[PDB]
């Protein structure tokens, strides 16, 4: 804060008016100029095909299995359930040490499941064991804030985002700390690993998201296009874009190579915030779980609502499309999971 | 249906049976959230302790009081997890009038919360032992930091102690009626009816919520 703050505060801004100028220079189109002639997806409708009941408290997270069949639901009752979407069977019911859990993830191999909440610890569970039950494999402590999103990189490394303004990557075998991604100025809420699993994005409560290099360790770029907290994030299937779901009643998407905001996806009649987002199979449909007990389906190219997913009497907190894009697994605070089409 | 599928269905049925069994136990107890300031001494508010949670039962009904710790001074996102508790215990000590302004601003922020619009608060004014010895001498009065702390009704100690309660009830009834109501009490370090006051407040809270749920209020 010395003479290098009447100097290096402007020089901390010189690279902001010379970045927005660089940013606003490479913009010869908006999304709705080359996606105007494409006919709309129509009034996309989707009825519920399987209602996975059984939870008591409100649902906070839900992750799809890689096999497009199993899924794991996290609720504030201290229970973790692995489902069989085809038959609505309950494969497992894993009790939790901490009754407050806000994260859940499925390992890509299907051998593990992670959870974490206000305990500031990611507990990773072993599904397939010779013992015949589900027991903790590791107790990933060393993080101060409450966990907000866990995602499995491989069978041995996991990426977590917490409320202490730090995204941060572990190694399950050692349980120690490999890389700590810092730079956010607020509670990080969401996480979305890239399909190539060499980068990821995270949205905090500072109206900004940062694309991190998981291999290297530093933020490649920061994306500021909102005005409130970002409590939802999801990655485009092609790996070159992603969407931000914020609580300011709008959900923007960004392009990694363009380093800009493409569309807003906002409606005047919608006032409630967004909780979760996901692209279905090709990025044309952007599922978005809102706060007014609904989940709009957005034609991403046209920025028009294609359908609604009403059927939850409480706010929708979970939203996830399956690997083959055959169904959705929206879950809400009414302790009810639902599968659509 | 295959035999293996039949056995899987039976295993699932057992899973739901065991899950439902725990629901009765979860619903029997009552959930409380403890919060306040660092100097409030929230831990010694409940002198019988028996996320730092405690499990105390008075009149043979169990309460689980959760003291959130380690989190920063935001409470913006992890407070959107407790909108099912019976009440929130906001403990503030009145040992210093320099921080009572910050305390009442914090109470205004937490009372006028979108996710906490239908949940009530029980106000515990901790550390009433030294309020007398801070007002009996009068070497530093509340009117130094406030405009009109010059009228309220030892007599002097009580007239000094009811002004903060007047301010807090003014804040509470400023916005939000019926759904949630503050419960201003007076707690000491050596006071013994702290859990009793909590119980006597939450029974009335449950009564009010049942009145609204039967549509009688």
């Amino acid at each position, epitope marked *: 804060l010395q003479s290098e703050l009447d100097q290096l505060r402007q020089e901390a801004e010189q690279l902001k008016n010379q970045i927005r100028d660089a940013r606003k220079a490479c913009a010869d189109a908006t999304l709705s100029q080359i996606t105007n002639n494409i006919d709309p997806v129509g009034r996309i409708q989707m009825r519920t095909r399987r209602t996975l009941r059984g939870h008591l408290a409100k649902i906070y997270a839900m992750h799809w299995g890689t096999d497009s069949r199993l899924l794991v639901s996290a609720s504030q009752d201290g229970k973790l359930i692995i489902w069989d979407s085809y*038959t609505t069977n309950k494969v497992h019911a894993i009790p939790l040490r901490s009754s407050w859990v806000m994260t859940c993830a499925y390992a890509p191999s299907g051998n593990y499941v992670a959870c974490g909440g206000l305990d500031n610890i990611c507990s990773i569970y072993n599904l397939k064991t010779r013992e015949g*039950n589900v027991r903790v494999s590791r107790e990933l402590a060393g993080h101060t804030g409450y966990l907000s999103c866990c995602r499995f990189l491989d069978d041995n490394q996991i990426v977590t985002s917490s409320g202490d303004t730090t995204c941060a990557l572990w190694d399950i075998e050692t349980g120690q700390q490999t890389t700590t991604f810092t730079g956010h100025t607020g509670d990080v809420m969401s996480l979305s690993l890239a399909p190539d699993t060499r980068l990821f994005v995270s949205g905090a409560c500072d109206a900004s998201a940062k694309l991190w290099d998981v291999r290297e360790g530093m933020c490649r770029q920061t994306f500021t296009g909102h005005e409130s907290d970002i409590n939802a994030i999801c990655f485009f299937p092609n790996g070159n874009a992603f969407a931000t779901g914020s609580d300011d009643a709008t959900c923007r998407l960004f392009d990694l190579r363009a380093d800009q905001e493409l569309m807003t996806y906002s409606h005047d009649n919608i006032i409630c915030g967004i909780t979760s987002v996901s692209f279905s199979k090709s990025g044309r449909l952007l599922l978005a779980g809102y706060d007014d007990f609904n989940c709009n389906v957005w034609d991403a190219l046209k920025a028009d609502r294609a359908g609604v997913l009403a059927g939850h009497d409480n706010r929708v907190s979970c939203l996830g499309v399956t690997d083959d894009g055959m169904a959705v697994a929206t879950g809400s605070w009414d302790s009810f999971l639902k599968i659509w089409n | 249906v*295959s035999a*293996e599928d039949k*056995a899987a269905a*039976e*295993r699932s049925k057992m899973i739901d049976k065991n899950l439902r069994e725990d629901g009765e136990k979860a619903r029997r107890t009552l959930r409380l959230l403890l919060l306040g300031a660092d100097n409030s001494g929230k831990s010694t508010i409940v002198k019988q302790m028996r996320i730092f949670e405690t499990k105390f039962q008075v009149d043979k009904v169990n309460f689980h009081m959760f003291d959130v710790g380690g989190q920063r001074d935001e409470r913006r996102k992890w407070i959107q997890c407790f909108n099912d508790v019976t009440a929130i215990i906001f403990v503030v000590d009145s040992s210093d009038y320099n921080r009572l302004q910050e305390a009442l601003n914090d109470f205004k922020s937490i009372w006028n919360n979108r996710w906490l619009r239908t949940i009530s608060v029980i106000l515990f004014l901790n550390k009433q032992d030294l309020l007398a010895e801070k007002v009996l001498a009068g070497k530093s009065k509340i009117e130094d930091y406030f405009p009109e702390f010059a009228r309220y009704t030892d007599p002097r100690v009580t007239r000094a102690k009811y002004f903060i309660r007047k301010e807090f009830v003014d804040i509470s009834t400023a916005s939000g009626d019926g759904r949630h109501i503050c419960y201003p009490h007076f707690t000491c370090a050596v006071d013994t009816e702290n859990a009793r006051r909590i119980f006597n407040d939450c029974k009335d809270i449950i009564l009010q919520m049942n009145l609204r749920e039967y549509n009688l209020v």
Partner: single-chain antibody
Amino acid sequence: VQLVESGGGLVQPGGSRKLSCSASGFAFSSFGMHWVRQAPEKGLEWVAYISSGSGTIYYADTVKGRFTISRDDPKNTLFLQMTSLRSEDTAMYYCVRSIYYYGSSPFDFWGQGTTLTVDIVMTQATSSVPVTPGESVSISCRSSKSLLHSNGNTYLYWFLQRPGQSPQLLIYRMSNLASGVPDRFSGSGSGTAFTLTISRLEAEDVGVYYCMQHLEYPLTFGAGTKLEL
């Protein structure tokens, strides 16, 4: 994980015998236990079944009413009551653990069997093949009905029985593999006829394999395909 049972011996016909299994080292209450008999030199014949908890009991036809199955969860104990010791009762009985959820591997673990002396037909036409070590083998089994169920998985199980060893799981539910089983093992086939094509077999593979179905709960056993030289 360690399963054991005791109560063998010699029985004068017309008597009762309490055969009990002492499970240890796993979540007993979350496993559907079984019982599988084997005559001294004939082949395995599944006899009974108990589900997780105290659900369905699925005695075999040849012993229905004559044998009773019981379990004691909190002490981790399993039983097999026997009445009226018969001429064909002389066999070695095994207790095999299995769990049924999506992706689980039933019949994964077996206990060392105790000897107590006195209808989908599945045939393994070859009961003895001298297979040169190091090259390959193509053990085959066939059924009478199509094991391909509507959900898309055939319910054939393969096992291995070395001399002086309890049966061990092998490629199960057509082309799936169990834990502790080398990747060289493989097997595929259609309904009504299956194969066990192995790649680069080595020593410690000589034994009598078995082919059992799991579509209808009477679980018939194949003749066996024991190898040699």
